[PDB]
Amino acid sequence: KLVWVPSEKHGFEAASIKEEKGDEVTVELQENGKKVTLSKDDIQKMNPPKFSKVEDMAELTCLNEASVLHNLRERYFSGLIYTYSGLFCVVINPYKQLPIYSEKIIDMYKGKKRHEMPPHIYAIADTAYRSMLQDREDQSILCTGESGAGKTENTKKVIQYLAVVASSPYGELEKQLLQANPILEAFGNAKTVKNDNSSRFGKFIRINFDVTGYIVGANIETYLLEKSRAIRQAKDERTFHIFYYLIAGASEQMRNDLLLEGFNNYTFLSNGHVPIPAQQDDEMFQETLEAMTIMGFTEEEQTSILRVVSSVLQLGNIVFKKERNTDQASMPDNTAAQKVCHLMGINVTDFTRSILTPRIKVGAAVVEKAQTKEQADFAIEALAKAKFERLFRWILTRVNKALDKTKRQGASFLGILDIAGFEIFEINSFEQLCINYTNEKLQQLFNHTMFILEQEEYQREGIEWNFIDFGLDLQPCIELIERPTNPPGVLALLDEECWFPKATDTSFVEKLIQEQGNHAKFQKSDKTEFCILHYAGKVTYNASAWLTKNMDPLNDNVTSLLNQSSDKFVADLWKDRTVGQLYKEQLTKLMTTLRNTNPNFVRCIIPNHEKRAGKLDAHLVLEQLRCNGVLEGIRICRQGFPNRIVFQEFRQRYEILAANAIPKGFMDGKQACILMIKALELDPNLYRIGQSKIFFRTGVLAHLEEE
Ligand SMILES: CN(C(=O)NCc1cccc(F)c1Cl)[C@H](COC(=O)Nc1cc2ccccc2cn1)C[C@@H](O)CO
Numbered sequence: 001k002l003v004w005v006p007s008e009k010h011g012f013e014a015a016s017i018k019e020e021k022g023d024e025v026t027v028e029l030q031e032n033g034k035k036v037t038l039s040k041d042d043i044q045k046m047n048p049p050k051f052s053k054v055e056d057m058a059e060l061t062c063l064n065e066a067s068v069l070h071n072l073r074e075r076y077f078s079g080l081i082y083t084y085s086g087l088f089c090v091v092i093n094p095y096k097q098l099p100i101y102s103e104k105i106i107d108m109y110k111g112k113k114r115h116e117m118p119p120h121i122y123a124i125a126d127t128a129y130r131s132m133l134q135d136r137e138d139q140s141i142l143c144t145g146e147s148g149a150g151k152t153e154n155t156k157k158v159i160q161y162l163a164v165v166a167s168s169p170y171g172e173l174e175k176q177l178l179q180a181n182p183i184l185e186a187f188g189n190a191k192t193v194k195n196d197n198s199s200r201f202g203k204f205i206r207i208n209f210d211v212t213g214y215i216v217g218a219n220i221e222t223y224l225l226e227k228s229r230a231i232r233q234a235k236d237e238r239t240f241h242i243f244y245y246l247i248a249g250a251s252e253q254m255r256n257d258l259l260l261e262g263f264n265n266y267t268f269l270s271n272g273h274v275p276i277p278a279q280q281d282d283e284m285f286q287e288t289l290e291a292m293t294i295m296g297f298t299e300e301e302q303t304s305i306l307r308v309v310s311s312v313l314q315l316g317n318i319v320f321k322k323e324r325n326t327d328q329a330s331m332p333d334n335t336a337a338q339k340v341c342h343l344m345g346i347n348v349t350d351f352t353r354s355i356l357t358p359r360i361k362v363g364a365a366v367v368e369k370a371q372t373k374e375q376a377d378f379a380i381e382a383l384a385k386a387k388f389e390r391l392f393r394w395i396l397t398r399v400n401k402a403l404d405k406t407k408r409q410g411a412s413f414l415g416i417l418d419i420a421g422f423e424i425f426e427i428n429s430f431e432q433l434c435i436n437y438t439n440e441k442l443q444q445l446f447n448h449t450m451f452i453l454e455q456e457e458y459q460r461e462g463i464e465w466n467f468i469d470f471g472l473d474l475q476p477c478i479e480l481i482e483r484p485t486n487p488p489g490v491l492a493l494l495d496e497e498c499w500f501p502k503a504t505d506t507s508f509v510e511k512l513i514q515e516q517g518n519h520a521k522f523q524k525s526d527k528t529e530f531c532i533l534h535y536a537g538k539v540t541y542n543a544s545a546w547l548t549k550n551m552d553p554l555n556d557n558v559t560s561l562l563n564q565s566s567d568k569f570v571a572d573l574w575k576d577r578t579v580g581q582l583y584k585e586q587l588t589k590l591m592t593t594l595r596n597t598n599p600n601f602v603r604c605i606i607p608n609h610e611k612r613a614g615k616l617d618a619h620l621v622l623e624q625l626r627c628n629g630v631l632e633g634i635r636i637c638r639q640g641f642p643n644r645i646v647f648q649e650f651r652q653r654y655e656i657l658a659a660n661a662i663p664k665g666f667m668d669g670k671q672a673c674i675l676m677i678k679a680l681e682l683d684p685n686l687y688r689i690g691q692s693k694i695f696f697r698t699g700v701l702a703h704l705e706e707e
């Protein structure tokens with residue numbers, strides 16, 4: 001008489017019913033005999049043992065959070081990370097290597113229907129691929145989840161799968177495609193508390209095909225590079241990989257050429273050398289040079305890149321003091337400035353004059369004011385950030401030029417999306433507002449997609465669709481952020497506070513409270529703080545330095561020197577309105593791309609916060625299924641007809657417990673079923689007859705596996 005009950009340890013737990021009393025129930029925990037008294041409302045029905053480790057949970061005959069968790073947990077400990085759940089897929093990071101990604105296995109999935117194999121990322125990629133050919137439509141695979149859940153690893157498996165089955169030992173273009181992420185990760189990833197290879201940018205990879213299905217080219221867009229990581233890092237964390245690769249792996253020749261000087265010598269490396277376990281930075285340096293070489297980067301190109309990486313570190317070694325009894329910046333030591341100008345190809349005394357005494361065009365004459373130590377420090381830091389962002393964008397453009405070399409744009413594409421999930425931190429700033437905004441758009445596309453798929457299924461069968469679009473809940477919160485006028489949203493207000501002469505951050509928070517103080521998803525929280533109610537939680541924002549972040553100011557004098565650098569590469573980097581405005585445009589264009597594809601969702605789940613293999617943290621998993629919408633899904637299909645079965649199938653399964661309903665001889669499938677149902681005296685509120693299937697409530701079909 002086993003049942004599921006809430007457990008503070010395990011999330012849910014097996015228990016046997018021992019006593020009832022109206023709405024009360026007394027139960028016996030199956031693990032330790034302990035007695036527990038609950039409301040009948042807290043009890044969840046258990047599925048029969050024939051569904052153990054079921055590969056598609058839509059097949060479950062009792063849809064509830066407890067039964068879902070159990071199935072995911074059971075498969076996981078048998079080393080089975082992939083599970084289907086009706087209209088989307090779920091993946092629990094194993095935190096160890098599995099024998100499931102070989103060349104053999106790739107060939108086994110070629111051509112297969114999702115349900116003819118065990119669930120795998122390969123099968124999502126293959127089915128998306130066949131649909132591209134068969135329907136002449138563009139496809140997308142979206143990989144989502146917390147830091148460390150496994151989005152980047154699954155993205156890379158879809159690339160390596162496609163480069164194998166849609167090739168035209170690989171061939172030049174596919175060899176280069178498989179090198180793109182190794183290059184981008186060296187420059188865009190960093191060791192973080194949650195992930196030793198954290199993506200500090202979002203990316204969307206477009207792969208282009210023929211009418212025939214042959215890979216013809218590819219293109220990559222990146223989003224939200226964490227520029228500021230180049231300047232300072234939190235406890236236990238590293239900057240981008242490339243800085244440790246170069247310092248640890250440079251030849252003696254290179255060490256000299258690029259004025260390199262070791263781990264403890266760089267203000268921009270906050271924690272000096274910190275190791276990544278099971279990787280050595282010198283070996284990694286070698287993999288990264290090899291990848292750039294396969295990509296077609298000339299030796300001089302590779303060296304110019306590394307010269308820039310080095311100069312970013314040098315900028316950080318400049319020190320400004322003040323003149324006696326003033327605030328005016330002075331540069332008593334000259335050495336850092338000399339080394340960096342050497343690497344940047346400009347003139348150290350013009351560079352100095354630019355930082356300390358900028359000429360400012362101001363109409364009625366040219367003001368040449370001296371800068372405070374605070375001002376010169378900010379300028380140098382803005383410059384190192386801008387310098388590195390430009391370097392990443394340059395590497396991205398040249399990766400793209402090597403990958404779109406054939407000038408053929410193909411017939412179709414398959415896009416792969418790899419962007420950070422919704423996460424709440426101790427501090428939530430402008431960059432988190434943008435990430436959390438992006439996930440409002442993405443989660444809405446998900447609710448909407450499920451909505452359209454359901455509505456079409458109901459339409460083709462008769463029955464009876466009375467829900468409004470599932471994605472509409474997210475609209476008020478989206479509108480609070482992105483609305484131009486009427487009431488202007490957070491972004492628009494920011495953009496306006498920026499053209500205000502004597503505005504502060506807190507000035508902005510106050511105008512916000514004024515115009516959105518009573519918006520449904522707003523809440524006043526400290527004087528730069530405010531809250532927004534997102535799909536997955538209340539988030540506290542701190543608006544400190546947002547005015548500056550929206551504007552992203554640089555010293556235009558030194559910027560001008562670098563535009564005329566005597567080094568051709570640095571010159572190219574510097575070959576040339578708000579940060580909020582620009583990002584909104586980037587996100588508008590991405591959503592437009594996605595809405596015009598057939599999307600496949602891959603929900604990545606992190607098992608624990610300790611990077612451990614074979615340990616599942618129940619409440620951590622449940623919280624993640626909540627952010628995803630997986631639990632809204634269970635609730636919504638609970639209020640519907642979760643079990644749906646074709647006539648022919650209903651016949652040859654329950655003719656056992658209903659043999660005498662159907663007379664001997666041929667009969668139409670709907671006819672036979674109607675008889676089987678009348679022969680069941682089933683309450684007409686618990687089923688619906690469709691064109692090809694019967695639609696059952698939960699868990700009407702469970703009731704029949706016995707009685
Ligand atoms: C019945 N169903 C299942 O797949 N049920 C298992 C299941 C559902 C949800 C979370 C889960 F974990 C699991 Cl095991 C298929 C279609 O039902 C949906 O999937 N809508 C849906 C709506 C949502 C609305 C908002 C947010 C998320 C949503 C997710 N999803 C259709 C099947 O008959 C065919 O395979």
Ligand SMILES: Nc1ncnc2c1ncn2[C@@H]1O[C@H](COP(=O)(O)OP(=O)(O)O)[C@@H](O)[C@H]1O
Pocket residue numbers: 093094095096097098145146147148149150151152153154195196197198199604
């Ligand atoms: N399918 C997998 N097989 C083996 N290891 C994995 C798998 N998925 C994730 N990992 C491990 O977890 C780490 C973090 O995964 P990653 O995909 O980088 O996270 P994110 O979702 O933040 O991109 C990886 O470095 C890898 O060690």
Ligand SMILES: [Mg+2]
Pocket residue numbers: 151152153197198199
């Ligand atoms: Mg990643």
